[PDB]
Amino acid sequence: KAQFQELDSKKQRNNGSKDHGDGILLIDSEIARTYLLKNDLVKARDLLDDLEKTLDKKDSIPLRITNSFYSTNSQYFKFKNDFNSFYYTSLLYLSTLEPSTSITLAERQQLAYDLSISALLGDKIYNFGELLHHPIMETIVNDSNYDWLFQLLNALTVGDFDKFDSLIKVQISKIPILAQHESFLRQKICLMTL
């Protein structure tokens, strides 16, 4: 960051075709991610809020800038376990995806897992059909982890109880996350169907 701040002052007029202020924003985003992993969630969030301000006042910023900022904001809600907040901000990452290398093969499969889990446990989501139709969750349904995970997501979309309740038994034993939300998930299917 200190090298990019020196560089930029001469080079904006020197090249006379290029910009170099773009780069500073992205470094703040990476700095915010490192703090989240480290588990200093508050340090990142107040860095992220100041960064937010700057971005809204610009309209000429690259499609790369928005992609780093939303990814970082999603990881914050996943540490906190705000299911609703995660769902919507991960949808915003998907939109801002670039054909350019700024993703891996790992990251697709792992966003797909975390999305599905958040969705089930949201308090206001009904974007189950919106997920189904989306590429991300479409491609991986043939692996053991994402097999049930698809069929749970599918049984909610369609209001169907015969497939839904049969799945819920398995996941109490299998996954302890979903062994204390058992009560929640049964109220949720009924709520949508109504």
Binding site: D59, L63, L94, S95, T96, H134
Partner: protein, 152 residues
Amino acid sequence: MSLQHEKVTIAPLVLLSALDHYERTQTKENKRCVGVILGDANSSTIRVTNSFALPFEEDEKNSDVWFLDHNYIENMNEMCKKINAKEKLIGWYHSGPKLRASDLKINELFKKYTQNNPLLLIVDVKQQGVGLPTDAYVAIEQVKDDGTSTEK
């Protein structure tokens, strides 16, 4: 730029001027007179006070080809600041008859001269709708409904 824009009122001087310009450049058969729209903006009510023709070409074979004069805009803006104090470039008009997707590309370049978001103000020169011919638009950016591709 601008985040205050709800409605655009149009005086009938502007609607007639655009109409005249189409027929005094000899541009017809779904070719385009494009001009700048002048008047106050950066308000919820945008009011367009005046308009004048800009030199403009289009080739419908490839719409990634068009001619817009860079000299002409500057010179007209200088003159127009004298007559009324209302007048400044707040967009560009299109002569219709429809909203082509070719209209994004023009709007992209047009942002540089403007002190706001430019407006894309369609004025139809042949009359349409039980409602008005005149329909106004602003360039904004948003996420689609497939949850993929942020398109302006």
